[PDB]
Ligand SMILES: Cc1cc2nc3c(=O)[nH]c(=O)nc-3n(C[C@H](O)[C@H](O)[C@H](O)COP(=O)(O)OP(=O)(O)OC[C@H]3O[C@@H](n4cnc5c(N)ncnc54)[C@H](O)[C@@H]3O)c2cc1C
């Protein structure tokens with residue numbers, strides 16, 4: 001049950017939905033939790049290789065949690081790096097808000 | 102157009118899979134990360150009411166991450182508590198390593 005793909009789809013839904021709700025002017029804690037959440041995922045994501053790649057991506061592209069727009073975009077760019085590595089379509093990050101409300 | 106219900110299903114799939122892959126003998130960091138992960142969720146979970154409900158549950162049921170079995174079990178109970186309040190069927194918590 002639950003393949004690498006099912007996990008990915010579920011998590012992206014959670015992450016992008018989360019970035020869709022992120023506040024315009026986040027508090028110091030909300031900013032901290034978002035960054036901590038990504039760090040935790042870089043170590044804990046339930047798919048070995050996937051977690052290593054996320055770790056790399058996170059190293060070179062730290063989370064932009066300054067606001068809803070920066071986080072939504074950042075998360076979309078991160079998702080695209082994975083898409084590209086897998087030979088999948090690359091999503092236009094100007095439409096993230098249209099895809100995730 | 103993700104719904105409150107699609108968010109929930111996605112999240113439980115993530116959590117439960119995470120709890121199914123948790124190590125038998127977690128390190129000090131892994132225990133810490135899993136715990137902080139639940140705390141982050143109770144503040145950050147999208148649906149407002151849902152965040153507050155989960156926050157009260159975590160209050161009286163602090164996360165147990167001493168091992169895969171304990172974490173799986175704790176997560177399973179914390180989920181039945183939610184199903185219950187929603188009028189849903191209860192999942193027997195010996196069957197966690199089943200759905201996940
Ligand atoms: C943190 C993380 C790291 C991952 N790393 C790997 C890896 O190293 N190797 C591996 O094999 N798998 C990895 N995966 C899995 C992978 O990214 C896929 O989820 C899986 O292959 C299924 O692809 P899918 O085509 O159904 O679309 P996903 O990539 O799962 O799609 C979610 C859906 O969201 C949308 N979407 C697509 N791109 C974006 C975007 N840029 N922004 C907003 N929405 C978008 C589309 O509607 C799409 O169908 C990872 C998943 C996560 C959550």
Ligand SMILES: Cc1cc2nc3c(=O)[nH]c(=O)nc-3n(C[C@H](O)[C@H](O)[C@H](O)COP(=O)(O)OP(=O)(O)OC[C@H]3O[C@@H](n4cnc5c(N)ncnc54)[C@H](O)[C@@H]3O)c2cc1C
Pocket residue numbers: 105106107108109110111112113114117142146150151152154155176177178179180181182183184187189191192197200
């Ligand atoms: C932390 C958290 C808090 C939530 N709080 C609320 C809330 O306050 N209000 C609200 O309207 N919604 C809330 N939700 C959403 C809700 O719990 C549902 O996810 C949603 O209603 C969809 O229900 P579903 O019937 O598809 O099953 P879910 O409850 O999403 O099911 C996941 C699936 O996992 C299984 N499963 C069921 N019970 C267990 C268990 N005890 N252990 C292991 N697996 C189980 C079954 O196979 C089931 O179909 C929350 C979600 C999360 C992740």
